[PDB]
């Protein structure tokens, strides 16, 4: 299919249902369709910078918008979780993070914060010619990783060079962000990882309020240590 009804659009975009007959269909890109925010929605229905699709197209063709330090001219480019969006004309940098409600929230950041991002290590494997590499959640393949980096770890990627500045191991007491399930958007600390081989591993997460909740491992994203997140939170 190539057409998306507004009522069928994802909930997390915050789009109003009755605005039109159709909603933008996120084109293929780093993030999944149900886990992405197309640039048109971000520019029009969230920032209110543009009043219609044609204005968004004009803005993009002017090359005023950068995603992760690269200029994008596709209206439906699927920006997603932890994607750095730079508007140089206004001098703003934004980082996409879910809210407790489960919707993307436009969080402004500093230039240094914009310079880097974090990626969850989805895979670690050796490529051709015996060159180790890591695949993150945003589809980035980074070569020559640090040996200590393992799956479920989080790597701090410098956008300009695309190289791993630092890394965080997955361990109890680490600060985690939920990216799935009913607990989507919640922040807490790992307490214990319940392990079911051949099944979805489970992580217990305790919030600052001492409330505890259980979530599948795939939906967990290490973002730092307790009291020391590596990114500015809203």
């Amino acid at each position: 299919k190539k057409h998306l009804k507004r009522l069928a659009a994802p909930h997390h975009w915050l789009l109003d249902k009755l605005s039109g007959c159709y909603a933008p269909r996120p084109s293929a890109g780093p993030h999944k369709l149900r886990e992405s925010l197309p640039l048109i929605v971000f520019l029009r229905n969230r920032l209110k910078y543009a009043l219609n699709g044609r204005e968004v197209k004009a803005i993009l063709m002017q090359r005023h918008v950068k995603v992760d330090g690269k200029v994008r001219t596709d209206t439906t480019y699927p920006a997603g979780f932890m994607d750095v969006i730079t508007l140089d004309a206004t001098n703003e940098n934004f980082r996409l993070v879910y809210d407790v409600k489960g919707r993307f929230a436009v969080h402004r950041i500093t230039d240094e914060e914009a310079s880097y991002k974090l990626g969850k290590v989805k895979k670690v494997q050796l490529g051709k010619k015996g060159v180790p590499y890591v695949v993150t959640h945003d589809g980035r393949t980074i070569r020559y990783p640090d040996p200590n980096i393992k799956v479920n770890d989080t790597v701090k990627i410098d956008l300009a060079s695309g190289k791993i500045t630092d890394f965080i191991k997955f361990d109890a007491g680490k600060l985690v962000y939920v990216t799935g399930g009913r607990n989507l958007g919640r922040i807490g600390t790992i307490v214990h990882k319940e392990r079911h081989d051949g099944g979805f591993d489970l992580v217990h997460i305790k919030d600052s309020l001492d409330n505890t909740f259980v979530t599948r491992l795939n939906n967990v994203f290490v973002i730092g240590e307790q009291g020391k997140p590596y990114i500015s939170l809203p």
Binding site: H11, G102, G181, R182, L184, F200, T215, R216, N219
Partner: peptide
């Protein structure tokens, strides 16, 4: 078994 799937209706308000 457990779904662990987000549900929009639960978070969406039903006050009306």
């Amino acid at each position: 078994h457990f779904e662990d799937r987000f549900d929009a209706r639960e978070h969406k308000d039903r006050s009306n």
